[PDB]
């Protein structure tokens, strides 16, 4: 096209953890993503 060379990065991917303090205490569930940023959630 114009030969403006380009870089490739494996697009943000990662595991998910869950923040939950026990069914007895409550049921609110929060989510954690590790190998990514909030910009591309």
């Amino acid at each position: 096209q114009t030969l403006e060379i380009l870089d490739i990065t494996p697009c943000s991917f990662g595991g998910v953890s869950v923040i939950t303090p026990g069914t007895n205490t409550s049921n609110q569930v929060a989510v954690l993503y590790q190998g990514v940023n909030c910009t591309e959630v």
Binding site: P10, G15, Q34, G35
Partner: peptide, 23 residues
């Protein structure tokens, strides 16, 4: 840290719970 030298297609390093700062 400087003595030693410096997202891999399905295999990842996880962060430590204990960052170098907290360490």
């Amino acid at each position: 840290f400087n003595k030693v030298t410096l997202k891999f297609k399905g295999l990842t390093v996880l962060p430590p719970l204990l960052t170098d700062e907290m360490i």
